[PDB]
Structure formats: C-alpha cells, structure tokens
Design a protein around this ligand. Structure first.
Ligand code: ADP
Ligand code: ADP
Ligand code: MG
Lengths: 438, 433, 55, 155
C-alpha cells in the first residue's frame, strides 16, 4: 500500500552525510559530492543545534540543479522533528489577507518552539468493577465506586459526582484499560483487556486485546507540551484564534500582543517554566522577495527570538523586485552583508553517475551499466533532472515490454519520446511562426 | 539567554561631562555621534519638546541601529521605545497614515494609579434573587460577609460552575469571576472527584489594592475603538464579526486626550513622552513623508529617531525624484542629522573582541589580527559573523580557543558578498537572469 | 529510637535580593533580624505576586 | 477568562523558596516510603503558604494554628490518628500545649528553628512520646549563609 508520502525529488536525501568532524563523505545518506557546501551546511547545522545565536542568515547560491534544495532537505532531515523547520517559498509572503511584513513575522515565529514540561499524577489500570447509583427521578447526588487493577495492585476508589459524570460520558465498562489524570479528571480509554459477554447482540467484531498495565496504580509521569510562538500569538490574538490556527484568517496580529508574548516567554525561560527551541526558516527562491521584505528581514534578524534563516537562490546580478537596481543574487547589499554565502559547485561525471545510482536505488529500478553510461552522458549534456526523469520513464518502458533491467534501448526510446528544454527550443525555432507570440 | 546582534550594547558610554569615552558600554567609536545621541537622550528626558525628529545617517555597518538601541538603554524600560521598520506601514487592513499615527501614540506612555476591589473567599450560599440577581455568602480565615451582586456576575458564576464549597476570586472593577477550586477542607471526602483543590483565603473577604499600571495612549485608543469591557452580547458580536484593525478617528483621539488630561489633573496619572524609532525610513513613500510633516508638527507627538543608509536615491512613490537620503528635502529640513562614519581597523578589532567576549568565545591574538584583516576587506559584519563557526570548528578539533587556522578554514568555507559577486560575474552565463 | 537530620537549602533570587536589601538597610537589629527570618521563610510573607488585570 | 485576568502560577510559590523545593523532595520521598509527617513552623502566615504549597502538590493536611478552639484540637488529633489519608499535619511549635498525643505520625519536619531548644524538644516529643511503635526521624531545614545558621548554632 502507498502512503501519502511517495517518491519525490528529494526522497533519497536522509541527511548531509557527514562524520564527527563534519567532513563530508563522498556518498552517504543520499548526498554525493558538494563537499565544501556540505561541510558549510554541517557547520550551520551545529550552530542551529547549539541554539545560542539568534538571527543568523545563510545563503546557498549556485547554478540550477546544483543541490541547494537538496542540502536544505538534508539539513532538515538531520535536525529531526524536535527542532522546528519552516520551509516556505519566496512567493508565499505575498498574501491578500496580511502584509508582507506580517507574513515574514509569522514565518519567523513558526520557527521558534516553546516547550512546557510538567509532572502529573496518573492512574492507569484495568477496570474490574464499576458501580454507579443514581436517583430514579429528579436532581440528586450520584454515588459510585470503582475498582482498578494492575499486575501487582488492586484498589477500590470512592467516586465523586464529577468523576461519575466523566466515567458515564466515556462509557467505561469492565475490562477497559483506562487512564485517569487526577488534576483535570480527563479519562482516556486505551483498549480492552478482554472481550464482552458473547450473549449480547449487535455488538460487532471484537478487536484485539491490550495487556494489563504493570507496576503501581498511581504513577507520576512527565507531560511535555510544545507549541511555536506563532501558535501562541494566534490563540492570544482573538477568541477564535484556535480556529484561526487551522483556517488561517489570522489577519494582522497587533504588535502589542507579540511584545507581551515575548515578555511572557522570557519570564518563563528565566523561571524555568518553558524552554525555547530555536529552529530554521528556509525560504526557497528568495529572489522573489521585494525590497520591502528584504528591508524587514534586515532588522527582523536582530531580535533575540529570530531563528536561523537559510535562503537559496540561483540568480546572478539581477534586478531586485520592486526596484530598478541590479544586485548580486537579487538581494540588496545591506542584507548580503548580514549573511554568509555557501557556494555550490557543478557536478562532475562520476558525481552525476553516483546521483543516478542513488536515484535508481530509491525508485527500485534496476539498470544496466551501459544504460548508466548513456544516461550519465545525457545528464551531462542536458541536465541532471532530465536524466532523473528518464530513469522512471525508461523503467516504465522496460516494464511495458515485459523486461527486468533497463537497457540502452529503453533510454533511447524515452529520449525520443520526451524532450528536454534544448531540443524543444530547437523544434520551436523550426516552426516559429506556428507558435503564437514571438 | 540567546545572543542577538546588539546584545553587547548596554549604553552610550558617556562621561559626566557628556563626552564620549573611546570604548565603553559596548561602543567603540562614533564619539561625535554618541555625544549627539546623549544630547538627544537629555532632550527626551526633559519631557518638554514634542515632535522633534532626528536622522541617523551613514553607510551600513556604522552602528545606527546600535546607537538607537543605546539611546533606548540609556532611557530605561520606563520610557517607551517603539522600534518600527519602514516596510511595516504597508498593511492590507488600515491606511499607512493610520499605521504611522498608531505607532506615534504607541510611543507615548502613561503610568496611572488604580485601585482594585477584590471579593475572595469560599462560597457558602448562592441564592438567586428574582433578570435574577444573586445573594452570595463568602467566608475566609478572618470572617464572613454576605454580598448582593449583579445578574451579570451571577451568569459568570454559573459559567464558572461555582457551587457551595468552592473558592472564588471576584474583581469588582471588571466583574471578572474566577473559580479557583473546591476548598481544601473537602479534599478528603472522596478518592476520585476530578477537582483541583485550593486553600481557604487567609485575608479579608473584601480587599482593596492600589497598583501602578503601565499603559500607552494607543492602548486607550484601541480599548475605546473596539470595546470589550461591557461583557454584553454586542461586544462579543463586534469582536467576532469585525476583527480587523480600523482607522481610529481624530475625535476618539481628542476624547482620549481629554480623559488623560483629566487623569493627570486628578493626580493619579503620570505622562512619559517616550520615543519612536523608524529604522528603514527610505522604505516609506512620499505620502508617508508628507503625513510625517504634520505629525511631527503636532504638539502631542513623541521624539522620533530616523535611520537611513541610502545615498542620492529616488524617493519611493515618485517617478524620478531623487533626494539625498531617500527622504524629501522638506522632511530633512525638520530633522537634526547625526552623521556616522566608517570604522578604522583598530575600531574593527575592538568591536570584534567585544563581540567575541559577548558570545563567550576565546580568540587568540593571531586569530584576532587575522579576523581584523579579513574585516578590513569584505565588511565588519562578515568578520563578526565568522566567530561562532570558528568556535564550533575549534570545539570539534578539541581546542578551547580559536586559532588562525580555524579562521582561515571558515573564511574558505563561507564567502562574503564581494567574493560571491566575483564568482557571479565570472560565470554570468550559467546563473539564471 | 530517634534520629536528627539537618538539611541545608539555598535561597531563590527574590529571597537573595530581599536579604541583601535588608542587610543594606542594617547600616534596629531586632527588626532586621525578624525581617531576615521572614525572608528566609518565604518572600510571599511580604507581598504576593500581583494578579494582573486590565485597567 | 484567560484573556480577562491572570493569576500568579501556583508553581512559582515553590520556585521562590528553596526550602519549599527541598521540602517537596523530602515529602515526596516520605510518601513514597510510606510515612506521615509533622511540619512545625513559628509563623501562621508560613502555615498559610505551606497550605498553598501542599494543596498545589496534592498532600492532604490538617491544621492547628494556635487560634483553633480547644474542643476542635482533640477532634483534629483523633481524626489524624484515625485517618491514614492525611499525609501531613502542619503545626505551630508554641501552641498545642502538652496534652496533644500525635503518635500516629513517624516523621517531624522543622520548617524553621526556634531560639529555645525546649520548644523544639516538646514538638519532637509530641510524636516521640511513649506508646509510639515506629522509628522517628527529625528533619531540620536551614538556609545556607543566613540567620538560620546562627539560630541553629544558638540552639
Ligand atoms: N549532491 C547531491 N547529492 C544527491 N542528490 C542531489 C545532489 N544535488 C542534487 N541532487 C538531486 O538532484 C535533484 C535536483 O537538485 P536540486 O537540489 O533541485 O537543484 P537546485 O539546487 O537547482 O534546486 C534533486 O532531486 C536532488 O535530490
Ligand atoms: N560603535 C560600535 N561599537 C560596537 N559595536 C558596533 C558599533 N557599531 C556597530 N556595531 C555592531 O555592528 C553591527 C552593525 O550595526 P548596525 O547598527 O546594524 O549598522 P547600521 O544600523 O549602520 O546598518 C551591529 O551588530 C552592531 O552590534
Ligand atoms: Mg531548489
């Protein structure tokens, strides 16, 4: 069965593939080559993990198809789910609901996580017998008694009215393994230790059982709650903020709310209530930001709640959007002075062949050596992405003719069927008048 | 605490005569600029002039924002300091002039004395009195008192599910009823009650506490423009149906001004004029500058500090009108210009050393000299930003201090703007656009 | 049988600040002594953390 | 409600006093090992703060603060000696007289030390007296580099 996540462009990248000294291996964790850029990415990753310096900016710049987004995905996979990683495109900040500065602020504050750790008393056991006595008619005080069992304990609890109501709402029966939090009174059923009586009808197919919990009844467990700054801002902006967390529609959050939240989070950090988990914001194709967005970035990186900012761009000296000024990478020099630039070099023949081999391994495609040579030649002549696509195309063509290994004939067939940019442009020049404009 | 870009700036480093010490309070040069900023700080502390504008002008990396934050630190946390970027006036909800006015009112603070009336105790009687009022009996460790409360308070008590035996907190000013828990004396009756218990209050049933509240004029304007203090259905409806910002009228601001003047006359309020800081002023358009003319001419406005690194540049919103700082000459006539200069290599070394000490990094003299040389070319910002990666490299190699080899390795790994520009120029045909 | 244990405890930041303020106010000794004992007991004996509400 | 009024966190009561943290650790250990604790303090406001802390942590307690009526004192003694749920019994050293028979507990914690060791001895003997069938442990809490070291030295 196929999960919602399938083989994508960067599905083979499991990390930067570095050793302890941040020295890049030639081929490890999907990454091949780009040794200097991977070493720089590892240094940046260590800086992120340390989480002590706020508002650091790194720019991964290089020619198209050199692995900028691959390096970003490797950094994201090496960080792990514990550290926030907000990946957005540059075009996403242009929104009809909010200003560009508001979108950038929300992107920054989605990359900082606030973690609250507290210890609570927890009762987890198998329900042996539950008895609830209620008045037949009219308002009255329900009286009840509950018996819970573990492998080494069994205690009979006298129940109050609100716990009676909670148990009634949850429909707790005998044999249900339930968890009760003493403070909030929340009850969560986590399984049935055995089946219900067979003589009952309209009950459905009984599922699998759950082994009874061991140890003491009333334990003490550590509960961890982690939210981002953006979630706090949204739920504090208005009453319907919890719904705005999912529908968007947050509008523009007042600066007063954000200042208060920053102060409160600082107070929690000083008092040891909460820990701040700085993350990364990755803006792919940062050249689509305009001058106002860059100017906002300039001073927004100077806050102590700012995350590490990583940008990727493949532009040379290009006009800055919203202006008539040519600048390196499409970025104003004032922002370029605030950031370290990581250059990506073009790939050689052996690096291209190794990338093709890793892609074929990821896609479960078996290819011959001659086919690998031809595909590497095509990738060097045309582009890496075209060869990557021809991998799957030739796999399908080979499977159509009831084969098992992708041969040179299949690669030639898919090369004939599907065109790259260069051959398409040539054929369009051959029939220039037929196409509509220019 | 995380270390930010200006975490070492603690003050202006001025002596008693107003002259600028060379290296003090995390500042290394800009003695003339620091003396001017000290004069501006004294002006803000005088609380006499209104709408006096100052422009910090100079190339990037010359510590204009550092000087603004140093002014903020010199003033103290009591004096409001609102930092805003020029790009923030372009909201999709309200007009740009409204944003400017809101930040102007945000810069003016008000310290007002308030008395809180508190009913705190364990509920012993909750008897409705037919719209139905409530008669409530509260007991503490010091006594018992019976109170008659409004039907809104009764509705709040019902919403809090307050029953006989619960410890409650009532604020008489806002009518805010909070149920804290079932009294501790009943914590033994059951074994599983699904309740949070709270001890009996040990003071009196009725308490009056006087506190000092720190508010701004903008807060009063917002409270009076999108009211939520009535606790009626209409307030909730207005909050839910109209959540966006609105263009507050001059009439509301005049009424709020009258209210604040009345409070000050009564002796229960103190005014703190405060400061507004606009960092990227060149990002404003001609309409914003034209509005700022009248806004600065106002007798209510705060002291505004502007910053700009632009040269002879076209003003935004105009076709081809070019002005010395991106600021039209009319507004430049209304500002006092503080000029910041580029730093000498000695000052660059001093700033690098201060930043290294701030980030908890030990750097050798040879490494410090090499990094200052790297900063002589490229920029000071680039040289400063190599400190943490070099520390990480030294830690990886087992060294507790940065040597010259680590700085060289980091500089090889990470390019600066000029080196990347050279690479782009050499390979213009390979990059897009 | 009976046993006696003595456990040493450290002061919080608020307790340390109050203790230093009182020791500075020293320069009668009985009143200072009582205030220091109260500080060592709990700083909430002087003023609880405020319940903050809108104006 | 959360947007309308904010109350100080009950956790900050323990965070502002090292004695409260150490006493929380000690009381958790004592409840784990299955003992009953007597807490003696010289001040009734300290009794109130201890009530807040114990109720926050979930320790059931009874209180005799020296202002309780005499007829209630015997009832409280009988309830504490009869009820096994009541973990702690906060008391004032200067009160209670000599007629109180608290043999139900087996641990005494002195939150603060009295200038007169006789009062602490009486507080101990309230639980160490004849007819008590368990080992008695006495815990004294002293703040480092404070007046309490002088108080302990004098005692
Ligand atoms: N060094 C590398 N190692 C492994 N795969 C790579 C490498 N560089 C690029 N790729 C793969 O090539 C494809 C295109 O590279 P990509 O990162 O999209 O280029 P760009 O930097 O132009 O975005 C991606 O699917 C990526 O996984
Ligand atoms: N006089 C100074 N002393 C110490 N550090 C400085 C000084 N001037 C600038 N810096 C540092 O150099 C960096 C650039 O300052 P910034 O105010 O951002 O420049 P500008 O505002 O002119 O663009 C900041 O991180 C600041 O901490
Ligand atoms: Mg990409």
């Amino acid at each position: 069965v196929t999960r919602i996540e399938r083989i994508g462009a960067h599905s083979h990248i499991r990390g930067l593939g570095l050793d302890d000294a941040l020295e890049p291996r030639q081929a490890s964790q999907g990454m091949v080559g780009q040794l200097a850029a991977r070493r720089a990415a590892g240094v940046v990753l260590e800086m992120i993990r340390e989480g002590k310096i706020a508002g650091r900016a790194v720019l991964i710049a290089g020619q198209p198809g050199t692995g900028k987004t691959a390096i970003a995905m490797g950094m994201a996979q090496a960080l792990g789910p514990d550290t926030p990683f907000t990946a957005i495109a540059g075009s996403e900040i242009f929104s009809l609901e909010m200003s560009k500065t508001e979108a950038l602020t929300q992107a920054f504050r989605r990359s900082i996580g606030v973690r609250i750790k507290e210890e609570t008393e927890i009762i987890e056991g198998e329900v042996v017998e539950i008895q609830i006595d209620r008045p037949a008619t009219g308002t009255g005080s329900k009286v009840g008694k509950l018996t819970l069992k573990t492998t080494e304990m069994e205690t009979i609890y006298d129940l109050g009215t609100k716990m009676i109501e909670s148990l009634t709402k949850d429909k707790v029966q005998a044999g249900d393994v339930i968890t009760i939090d003493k403070a909030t009174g929340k009850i969560s059923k986590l399984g049935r230790s055995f089946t219900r009586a067979r003589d009952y009808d309209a009950m459905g197919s009984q599922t699998k059982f759950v082994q009874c919990p061991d140890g003491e009844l009333q334990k003490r467990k550590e509960v961890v709650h982690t939210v981002s700054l953006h979630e706090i801002d949204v739920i504090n902006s208005r009453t319907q903020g919890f719904l705005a967390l999912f529908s968007g529609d947050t509008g523009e959050i007042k600066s007063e709310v954000r200042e208060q939240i920053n102060a409160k989070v600082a107070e929690w950090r000083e008092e040891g209530k909460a820990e701040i988990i700085p993350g990364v914001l990755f803006i792919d194709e940062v050249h689509m930001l305009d001058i106002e967005s860059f100017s906002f970035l300039n001073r927004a990186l100077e806050s102590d709640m700012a995350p590490v900012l990583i940008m990727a761009t493949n532009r040379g000296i290009t006009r800055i959007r919203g202006t008539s000024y040519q600048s390196p990478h499409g970025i104003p020099i004032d922002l370029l002075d605030r950031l370290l630039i990581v250059s990506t070099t073009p790939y050689s023949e052996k690096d291209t062949k190794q990338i093709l081999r890793i892609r074929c391994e990821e896609e479960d495609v078996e290819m011959s050596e001659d086919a690998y040579t031809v595909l590497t030649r095509i990738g060097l002549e045309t582009s890496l992405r075209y060869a990557i696509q021809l991998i799957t195309a030739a796999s399908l063509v080979c499977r159509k003719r009831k084969g098992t290994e992708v041969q040179v004939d299949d690669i030639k067939r898919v090369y004939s069927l599907f065109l790259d940019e260069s051959r398409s442009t040539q054929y369009m020049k051959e029939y220039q008048d037929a196409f509509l404009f220019n | 605490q995380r270390i930010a870009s200006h975490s070492h700036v603690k003050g202006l480093g001025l002596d008693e005569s107003g002259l600028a010490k060379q290296a003090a309070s995390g500042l290394v040069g800009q003695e003339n600029a620091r003396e001017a900023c000290g004069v501006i700080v004294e002006l803000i502390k005088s609380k006499k002039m209104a709408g006096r504008a100052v422009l910090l002008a100079g190339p990037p990396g010359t510590g204009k924002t550092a000087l603004a934050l140093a002014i903020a630190q010199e003033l103290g946390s009591k004096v409001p300091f609102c930092p805003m970027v020029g790009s923030e006036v372009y909201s999709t909800e309200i007009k740009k002039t409204e944003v400017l006015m809101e930040n102007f009112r945000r810069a003016i603070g008000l310290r007002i004395k308030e008395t809180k009336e508190v009913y705190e105790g364990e509920v012993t009687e909750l008897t409705p009195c037919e719209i139905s009022h409530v008669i409530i009996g509260l007991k503490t460790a010091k006594g018992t008192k019976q109170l008659k409360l409004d039907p809104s308070i009764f509705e709040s008590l019902q919403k809090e599910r307050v029953e006989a035996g619960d410890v409650i907190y009532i604020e008489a000013n806002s009518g805010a009823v909070k149920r804290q828990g079932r009294c501790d004396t009943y914590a033994t009756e059951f074994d599983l009650e699904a309740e949070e218990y709270v001890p009996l209050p040990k003071g009196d049933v009725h308490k009056k506490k006087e506190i000092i509240q720190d508010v701004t004029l903008h807060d009063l304007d917002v409270a009076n423009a999108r009211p939520q203090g009535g606790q009626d259905i209409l307030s909730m409806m207005g909050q839910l149906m109209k959540p966006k910002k609105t263009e507050i009228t001059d009439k509301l601001r005049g009424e709020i001004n009258k209210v604040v003047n009345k409070y000050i006359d009564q002796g229960i309020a103190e005014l703190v004029p405060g400061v507004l800081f606009v960092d990227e002023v060149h990002m404003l358009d001609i309409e914003c500058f034209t509005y700022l003319h009248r806004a600065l001419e106002s007798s209510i406005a705060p002291i505004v500090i502007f910053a700009s690194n632009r040269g002879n540049c076209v003003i935004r919103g105009t076709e081809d009108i070019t002005s010395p700082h991106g600021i039209p000459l009319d507004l430049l006539d209304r500002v006092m210009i503080i000029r910041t200069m580029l730093y000498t290599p000695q000052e660059m070394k001093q700033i690098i050393k201060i930043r290294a000490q701030t980030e908890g990094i030990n750097i050798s003299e040879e490494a410090l000299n090499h990094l200052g040389e790297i900063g002589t070319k490229t920029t000071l910002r680039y040289s400063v930003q190599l400190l943490t990666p070099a520390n990480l490299l030294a830690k990886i190699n087992g060294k507790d201090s940065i040597e010259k080899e680590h700085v060289e390795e980091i500089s090889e790994l990470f390019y600066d703007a000029k080196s990347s520009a050279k690479i782009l120029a050499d390979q213009q045909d390979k990059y897009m656009k | 049988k009976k046993y006696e244990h003595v456990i040493r405890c450290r002061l919080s930041k608020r307790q340390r600040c109050l203790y230093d303020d009182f020791m500075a106010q020293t320069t009668s000794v009985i009143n200072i002594l009582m205030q220091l004992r109260k500080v060592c007991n709990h700083p909430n004996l002087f003023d609880p953390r405020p319940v903050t509400s809108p104006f | 409600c959360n947007m309308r009024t904010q109350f100080p966190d009950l956790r900050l009561i323990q965070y502002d006093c090292g004695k409260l943290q150490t006493l929380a650790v000690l009381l958790r250990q004592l409840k784990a090992e299955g003992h009953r604790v007597l807490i003696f303090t010289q001040m009734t406001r300290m009794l109130d703060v201890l009530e807040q802390f114990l109720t926050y942590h979930g320790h059931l307690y009874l209180r005799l603060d020296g202002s309780t009526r005499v007829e209630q004192r015997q009832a409280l003694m009988e309830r504490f000696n009869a009820d096994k749920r009541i973990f702690c019994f906060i008391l004032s050293t200067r009160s209670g007289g000599v007629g109180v028979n608290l043999t139900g507990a087996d641990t005494v914690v002195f939150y603060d030390s009295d200038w007169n060791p006789t009062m602490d001895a009486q507080a101990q003997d309230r639980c160490h007296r004849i007819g008590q069938t368990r080992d008695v442990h006495i815990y004294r809490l002293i703040s480092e580099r404070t007046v309490e070291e002088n108080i302990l030295k004098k005692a």
